[PDB]
Amino acid sequence: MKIGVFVPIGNNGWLISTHAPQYMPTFELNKAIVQKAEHYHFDFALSMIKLRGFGGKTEFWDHNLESFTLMAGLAAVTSRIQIYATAATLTLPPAIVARMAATIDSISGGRFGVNLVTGWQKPEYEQMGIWPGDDYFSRRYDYLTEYVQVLRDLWGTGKSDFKGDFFTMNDCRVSPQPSVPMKVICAGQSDAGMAFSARYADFNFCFGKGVNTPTAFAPTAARMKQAAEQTGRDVGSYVLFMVIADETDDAARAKWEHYKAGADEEALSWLTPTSAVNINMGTLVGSYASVARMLDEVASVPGAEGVLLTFDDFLSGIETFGERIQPLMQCRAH
Numbered sequence: 001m002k003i004g005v006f007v008p009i010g011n012n013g014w015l016i017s018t019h020a021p022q023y024m025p026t027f028e029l030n031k032a033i034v035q036k037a038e039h040y041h042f043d044f045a046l047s048m049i050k051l052r053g054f055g056g057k058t059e060f061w062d063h064n065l066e067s068f069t070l071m072a073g074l075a076a077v078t079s080r081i082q083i084y085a086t087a088a089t090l091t092l093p094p095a096i097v098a099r100m101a102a103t104i105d106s107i108s109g110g111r112f113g114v115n116l117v118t119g120w121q122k123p124e125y126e127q128m129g130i131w132p133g134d135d136y137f138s139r140r141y142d143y144l145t146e147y148v149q150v151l152r153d154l155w156g157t158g159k160s161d162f163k164g165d166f167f168t169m170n171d172c173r174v175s176p177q178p179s180v181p182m183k184v185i186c187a188g189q190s191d192a193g194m195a196f197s198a199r200y201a202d203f204n205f206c207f208g209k210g211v212n213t214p215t216a217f218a219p220t221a222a223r224m225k226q227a228a229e230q231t232g233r234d235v236g237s238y239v240l241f242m243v244i245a246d247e248t249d250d251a252a253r254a255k256w257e258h259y260k261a262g263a264d265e266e267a268l269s270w271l272t273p274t275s276a277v278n279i280n281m282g283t284l285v286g287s288y289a290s291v292a293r294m295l296d297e298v299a300s301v302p303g304a305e306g307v308l309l310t311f312d313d314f315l316s317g318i319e320t321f322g323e324r325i326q327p328l329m330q331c332r333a334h
């Protein structure tokens, strides 16, 4: 099974809590995180893009770096880990994404890929006057279909004459083309989203589910595998979990409870047994060996090819993962 790190490009990472570690996302922190992940043979690092926050006491995701320039800087200080940036497709023309991807292909020596998202959060786009309207919910995947067709032409041949409802290319040129076949990843959960991924993505990100119910997402991965049969392409699922690990199960549970006890309800109001403290994320809470075991269970779910991990504390969570959890995982014996 592959393991990636979801890098905190947003302040406080994925915990919405006065008792959680408090930190701004800086280049240097993301650098320390990704270089530590790489030291422990993490397979990839991904940042999201988040153009508007949720406020409250912790000003949750009010402070966010931009994904392509962050990952270009991280590519320059790494040498093995795969690097993925997220394009919010409403905000960047496809030929710019195509040339940015070529550029980070160059920085990284072929280690770069792109996570394509339609955008769902209307205010992220409305705030800058670029929301298409409420037709967009229904048409997101049509737009994204034309978008990726333009990227495919440009990465494949260096040119595109594509013409659709949303784009008009007139002998559009992008060169250099990527040194390696450019990976596209998607995080579709809907039927349309999974059918998008089945056609154009290398893999699909889905949400892990429950607290300490590691195989609860299985039906989502089942649907994604069914979507992939429709195109004959091999598009596995990567599953997002938060790991809250410690020396014993009791100690990890005490941390989790402590985090939930500091919940920042004001920030939580703007947004809207799993907790909203981490956006109801799939959470694995346990001793190092309990977490290793639960992650081994994820690896056995049909369709599951990797996990994307957040931590309560990235610097020491990556360290304990690599020192205490990973060496116990069957799916990492390679």
Ligand SMILES: Cc1cc2nc3c(=O)[nH]c(=O)nc-3n(C[C@H](O)[C@H](O)[C@H](O)COP(=O)(O)O)c2cc1C
Binding pocket: 047, 048, 049, 050, 086, 088, 116, 117, 118, 119, 120, 121, 187, 188, 189, 190, 191, 192, 193, 194, 205, 206, 207, 240, 308
């Ligand atoms: C791992 C992961 C990363 C995501 N990153 C982003 C992001 O950077 N920006 C964003 O607007 N949405 C992001 N999303 C939300 C999805 O792109 C998506 O809209 C949502 O999962 C619902 O699926 P649908 O688009 O099929 O309705 C992410 C989802 C997952 C699972």
Ligand SMILES: O=c1[nH]ccc(=S)[nH]1
Binding pocket: 048, 050, 279
């Ligand atoms: O659930 C989520 N995790 C990270 C980013 C976004 S937008 N949503």
